[PDB]
Amino acid sequence: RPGGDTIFGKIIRKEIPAKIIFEDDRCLAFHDISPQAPTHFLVIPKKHISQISVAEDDDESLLGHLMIVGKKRAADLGLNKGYRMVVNEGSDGGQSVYHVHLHVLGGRQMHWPPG
């Protein structure tokens, strides 16, 4: 099945419910069920890429699209004071699901370091 069988692949195919914000032919934005900020959503490609460390050179446009969609959805959600975008890679990055995802967090002051 297209997208794979991680929870994110299932969400892409409407097999597991999610609170969807935005969808286009390349990606999907939906709210994180364990939010770490007052607003916390994910932008994922529909194409299955397990982790950023294995993304291909020709995935540049798609990865950039995640960020453009993230910033547009953040504006649509009224995050007018700003936000933080995060991609986790692997164990040290805290990556929970092996399907590439961009976190977008806002609605409060984010702190430094970023974890």
Next chain:
Amino acid sequence: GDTIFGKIIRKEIPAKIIFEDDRCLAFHDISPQAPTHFLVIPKKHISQISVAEDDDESLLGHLMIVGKKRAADLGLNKGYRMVVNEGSDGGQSVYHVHLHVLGGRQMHWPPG
């Protein structure tokens, strides 16, 4: 409005440069928050991700591909975290778009 990152791109002040191409520059952060902490920045002056244009999409992806390749070159085989900060709530320190790449330790949750 120019920034300190513009000065770094122009080679007017030093930084520990890791990689360069025709459209971006990667260099170690002067205030590292992990054993490895570097930045990938576009040479184009985009002040913040919120004003990035649609035509900038593949350039932004290029920052991430460069970041992941440099992370591998720097031995971050256990993983890493990529961060883009926007505005005051995001903690953005310089108004020139920059991708942070942090690793060499366990990164924690929440991410700030």
